Subunit: 94 residues, 5 copies
């Protein structure tokens, strides 16, 4: 008798992020029966070489790898994954 | 007898993000029976080389890889995945 | 007897994002029986080389790869995946 | 008789992030039956070489790897994964 | 008779981050039946070479590895994973 109760009684303007998972149980990359990224925030994510495959650059491979991150980049974020009730959130740039 | 109750009683203007998952159970990339990205925010995501395949650049491959991220890029975001009730959210640029 | 109740009683102008999943069970890329992107926001996503195939650039391949991200790009977003009741959301540029 | 109660009684505009997981049980990368990233925030994440595959650069491979992170990059974030009720959150740049 | 009660009575605008996990039980990288990153914040994470594979650079491999982190990068974050009720959070730059 599995019973789960979340936020049974709610009143008064609450700001909630709810993540309820119920589970019952009676080759470069292998992933199975998984749950990922219920609330995921990715900012300025970089990935260059991934899962190239079978025998990459196997023989006589002259490879020059150059990765440059030289950009003027501004990330101004207010209240990231932060619910807020009866609040004041402001971003002011002068 | 699996029973799940979420937000059974709601009153008063609540701001909610709900993610309820119920599960019962009675080759470069292999992924099976998975749940991903219920609430995912990807900002400025970069991916250059992925899952190239079988025998990439197998023999006598002269490859020059150059990745440059040199751009003026502004990301101003307010209340990202942040529900807000009876609040004030403002982005002001002068 | 699987029973799921979400937002059984609702009153008072709530702003909700609902993601309810119920499941019962009685080759460069292989993915099976999966659920993805219920609420996914992709901003400025870049992908250059993906799933090229069988034997890419197999023999005597002289390849020069140059990836440049040098653009003036402004992303001003207010209340991204953030429901808001009895609130004030404004983007003002002067 | 598994019973879980979270936020049974709620009143007065609370700002909550809820992560409830219920579980019952009666080859470069292998991952199985896992739950990841319920609330994950990734900022300026870099990954260059991952899961290259079988026999990368197996024989007579002259490879020069250069990774440069030389960019002017400002990350101003207020209230990251920090719900706030009856509060004042402001980002002011002059 | 497993019974778990969290936040049974809530009143007065509390700001909470809740992480409740209930569990019952009646080859470069192998990970199984794990829960990770319920509340994880990754800032300026770098990873260069990971999970290269079977026999990387197996024979006669002349490889020069150079990793440079020479960028002007400012990370100003207020209230990271710090819920705050009836508070004042401000980031002011002059």
């Amino acid at each position: 008798p599995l019973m789960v109760k979340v936020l049974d009684a709610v009143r008064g303007s609450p700001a909630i992020n709810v993540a309820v998972h119920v589970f019952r149980k009676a080759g470069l990359t292998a992933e199975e029966e998984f749950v990922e990224g219920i609330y995921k925030v990715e900012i300025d994510t970089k990935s260059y070489w991934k899962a190239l495959g079978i025998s990459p650059f196997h023989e006589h491979a002259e490879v020059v790898f150059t990765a440059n991150d030289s950009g003027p980049r501004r990330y101004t974020i207010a209240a990231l994954l932060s619910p807020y009730s009866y609040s004041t959130t402001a971003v002011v740039t002068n």
